[PDB]
Write a protein that binds this ligand. Structure first.
Ligand SMILES: Cc1nc(C)c(C(=O)Nc2nc(CN3C[C@H](C)C[C@H](C)C3)cs2)o1
Length: 110
């Protein structure tokens, strides 16, 4: 459905809008974080999700939400609590939560 993709697209932009520092909008730079992949099984970020979106890899809402949750859970897992990343993830989880709750309600009436 075009409206499903249209909704998914709008939702991801709302999610990106909460990341005012652009710290989740591209993959973690592995040149700067060489052990990142030692602990994180599946990295995720908003551009990768955008890529999945435009390739029709999100055919249901659950997979979209699951990748969102990875952006947040990865960041909390890897980063120590007293860091800017960890704090930003705690907040994104609450703000992202609400975005995804409203978006899922829209998908329900399709
Ligand atoms: C969600 C998350 N988990 C982790 C481990 C990280 C993480 O270390 N991100 C990093 N990004 C950069 C690059 N970045 C730095 C900014 C200050 C400016 C901007 C233009 C480029 C270096 S380290 O982010």
């Amino acid at each position: 459905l075009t409206p499903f993709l249209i909704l998914l697209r709008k939702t991801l932009e709302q999610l990106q809008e909460k990341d005012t520092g652009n710290i989740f909008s591209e993959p973690v730079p592995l040149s700067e974080v060489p052990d990142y992949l030692d602990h994180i099984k599946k990295p995720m970020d908003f551009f990768t999700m955008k890529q999945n979106l435009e390739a029709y890899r999100y055919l249901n809402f659950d997979d979209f939400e699951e990748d969102f949750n990875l952006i947040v859970s990865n960041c909390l897992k890897y980063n120590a609590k007293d860091t800017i990343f960890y704090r930003a993830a705690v907040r994104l989880r609450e703000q992202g939560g609400a975005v995804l709750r409203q978006a899922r309600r829209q998908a329900e009436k399709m």
